[PDB]
Amino acid sequence: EDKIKGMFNPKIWDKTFQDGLKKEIEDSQPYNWGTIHELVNDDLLRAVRKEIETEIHFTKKETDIYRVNQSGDLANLSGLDWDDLSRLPNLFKLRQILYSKQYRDFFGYVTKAGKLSGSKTDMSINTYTKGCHLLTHDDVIGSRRISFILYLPDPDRKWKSHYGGGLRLFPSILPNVPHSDPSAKLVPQFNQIAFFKVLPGFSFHDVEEVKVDKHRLSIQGWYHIPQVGEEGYIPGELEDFEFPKDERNILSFHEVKHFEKMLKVKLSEAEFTYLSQYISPEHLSSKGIEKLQKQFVENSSLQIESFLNDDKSELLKKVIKQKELEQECPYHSKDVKAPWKTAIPPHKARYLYIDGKEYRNFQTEADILEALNNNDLPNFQFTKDAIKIISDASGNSRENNFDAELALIDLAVFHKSTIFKKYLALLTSLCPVSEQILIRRFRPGMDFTLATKCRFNELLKSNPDIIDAVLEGTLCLTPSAGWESGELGGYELYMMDSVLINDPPAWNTFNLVLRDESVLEFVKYVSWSAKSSRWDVKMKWDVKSC
Ligand SMILES: O=C(O)c1ccnc(C(=O)O)c1
Ligand SMILES: [Mn+2]
């Protein structure tokens, strides 16, 4: 109990240091946080690092929100037992000093956090290697009160910014609506600690992907609200902001009656002619249709390869590749321009999309409230019109042309056609009654979605004819290679609340899934190492049985 203070940098016991740090935390941005360099006795932390590397077996784990080499999953033999640190005596001592009354008095003082539990120790040890990442979250769980991360990269080398693995903090547009882009990034060194009071609606942060073949070790922890009576402690002494909305617009009665009439291969020569403008002959034949029909009957899903015909395939591949190679992709939401929008908020998703609605760029609360007071509906031809006029002005250079947006919008218009929906009804024996179409681009090192269920149309819940499912299509147009292992991310994942579909990005594929209430779906974060964005067209429909 005497040697505890001496196991820290002596500056933290200095009144001048403490008061200075308290003020720095008070006045920090974008929410209250701070950092201390050279926190712990150097020999102790060096010994901890050596113990960890020697004694702990790390296991890669990937979910929608992270990829990390973990040690924490118990019931798996490699799982770290915090009740048995027999062989990690230095780690045992590190935990002891961090949760000591002496340190908690200091730390609670400078963070203005109030009392902190000494008995509720809560730490975990993780390494990040190339491709590892942890996407946006606020740490708000149970009795967590202060978050800290102590960093243990190689003590004899500087960790460089371009290595990645930075701790990024996100400012607040309004409570529970973090800005899509971070406003600060800490590049951590050995024996540096970062920390922040856990703040519902505000303490949003992530860990930037590690971009090089290095290992970075960290020890993440929390201080908790004390146990009742612990050291005297006495207890007590949003959908609206998501864009795009998971909402569909109902179809005209003309369309719905068309589909019913057909279901109660009744496609005309003229309709096949229209469908063959975009779709491969293989999938318009009597046999191809029969195969797809049976596959959907047996699986309630379809995974079609070479969906579009060669003409539209060649066109789209050219213009997408050209845009990838010769134009500057925006990498901040402020830089995104019509016809594109940024999906928000970043603790739910981040990607670029074209929805056909009037342009929005959400930098301020006022920008959001303006959109919510003035809801508008998609119109893809007007979006085309607007592009053409921006395009003519600048000139349509190799570096500014909208060739890819125009082709993609044309493709969206095809899927918006009454005849395509007739084809869809033919394949599925379902009658679409609503639609939402989005063109999406997932940039390397930025974009992703997280695991969510479909959103039923509330107004239609009482309708017996309408199936309790959402039909969802994905037309992938990703022309780059290297995705097959899933290691570059970008894979489309459908799973039950076991995996139904795990499809890395590929060129010219069409996935179709009839989702019941409990099916989860996401597109995994695209690695910085990916050779292009993931490009796709997303389609959703409410359906009734005929
Ligand atoms: O392990 C980390 O470095 C880390 C950083 C930020 N957040 C977490 C977390 O688990 O909340 C962990
Ligand atoms: Mn965290």
Residue numbers in the entry: 23 to 259, 279 to 305, 328 to 560, 587 to 635
Sentences from the paper on this structure:
OGFOD1 catalyzes trans-3 prolyl hydroxylation at Pro62 of the small ribosomal subunit protein uS12 (RPS23) and is conserved from yeasts to humans. OGFOD1 in Homo sapiens, Sud1 in Drosophila melanogaster, and Tpa1p in Saccharomyces cerevisiae were found to catalyze prolyl 3-hydroxylation of the highly conserved Pro62 and Pro64 of uS12 (RPS23) in humans and yeast, respectively (Ban et al., 2014; Katz et al., 2014; Loenarz et al., 2014; Singleton et al., 2014). We describe crystal structures of the human uS12 prolyl 3-hydroxylase (OGFOD1) and its homolog from Saccharomyces cerevisiae (Tpa1p): OGFOD1 in complex with the broad-spectrum 2OG oxygenase inhibitors; N-oxalylglycine (NOG) and pyridine-2,4-dicarboxylate (2,4-PDCA) to 2.1 and 2.6 Å resolution, respectively; and Tpa1p in complex with NOG, 2,4-PDCA, and 1-chloro-4-hydroxyisoquinoline-3-carbonylglycine (a more selective prolyl hydroxylase inhibitor) to 2.8, 1.9, and 1.9 Å resolution, respectively. Prior to its assignment as a uS12 P3H, crystal structures of Tpa1p revealed that it contains tandem DSBH domains, only one of which, the N-terminal domain, was predicted to harbor the catalytic machinery (Kim et al., 2009; Henri et al., 2010).
We determined structures for OGFOD1 and Tpa1p in complex with the broad-spectrum 2OG oxygenase inhibitors N-oxalylglycine (NOG) and pyridine-2,4-dicarboxylate (2,4-PDCA) (Rose et al., 2011). Following optimization of hits from high-throughput crystallization trials, diffraction quality crystals for full-length H. sapiens OGFOD1 (542 amino acids [aa], 63 kDa) and S. cerevisiae Tpa1p (644 aa, 74 kDa) in complex with Mn(II) and inhibitors were obtained (catalytically inactive Mn(II) was used as an Fe(II) surrogate). Tpa1p crystals were monoclinic and contained one molecule in the ASU as for the reported Tpa1p structures (Kim et al., 2009; Henri et al., 2010). OGFOD1 and Tpa1p bind 2,4-PDCA slightly differently. In the Tpa1p:Mn(II):2,4-PDCA structure the 2,4-PDCA C-4 carboxylate is positioned to form a hydrogen bond to the side chain hydroxyl of Ser240, yet surprisingly is not positioned to form a salt bridge to the side chains of Arg238 or Tyr173 (corresponding to Arg230/Tyr169OGFOD1), respectively; in part this appears to be due to the unusual conformation of Arg238. These observations provide further evidence of flexibility within the 2OG binding pocket of the uS12 hydroxylases, a feature that might be exploited in selective inhibitor design. In all of the OGFOD1 and Tpa1p structures, the inhibitors ligate the metal in a bidentate manner. Previous structural studies on Tpa1p, which is reported to be a homodimer in solution, identified a large dimerization interface between the CTDs of two protomers (buried surface area ∼1900 Å2) (Kim et al., 2009; Henri et al., 2010).
